[PDB]
Design a protein around this nucleic acid. Sequence first.
DNA 1: TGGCCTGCAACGCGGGCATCCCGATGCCGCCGGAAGCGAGAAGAATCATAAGCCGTAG
DNA 2: GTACCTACGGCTTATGATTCTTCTCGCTTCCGGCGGCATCGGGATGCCCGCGTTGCAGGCCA
Length: 49
Amino acid sequence: QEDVVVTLSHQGYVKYQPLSEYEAQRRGGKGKSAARIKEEDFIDRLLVA
DNA sequence: TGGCCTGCAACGCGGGCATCCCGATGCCGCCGGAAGCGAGAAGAATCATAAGCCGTAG
DNA sequence: GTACCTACGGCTTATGATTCTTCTCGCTTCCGGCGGCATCGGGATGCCCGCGTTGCAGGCCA
């Protein structure tokens, strides 16, 4: 099974990681220190299968 | 340990109100294209019909 | 001295036939596509003040 989530970035990077690790990394608030970068990358598409 | 949310205070701009100009649009009439799947034809998966050898018997 | 046939049963290997599935054509008609006009709801601008926005400092969070 290996329940994972597939996240596609805006620059075209595709990858997946298990749902447990994804929920563990999701814990906490996103720091605006990285948001000050106008050339960063963000998630474009998300799906769980 | 570094950074983020929020309270307090000061500043500014747009929401609301109306209307004049404006842009879509519903309707009417004339013209275009695609769908319509039904049917013909081809390719492929599956089913049907022979042997080869395993070892004692003739 | 020196080889040559099938019967009893199970799994494969080689080849043709059959039906399922899919590729491709059929013109036509109906649903739609498109041009034009009166209409009706909408956007922007004039104006004000009060709420939205923002600077600064404090306490809390990852």
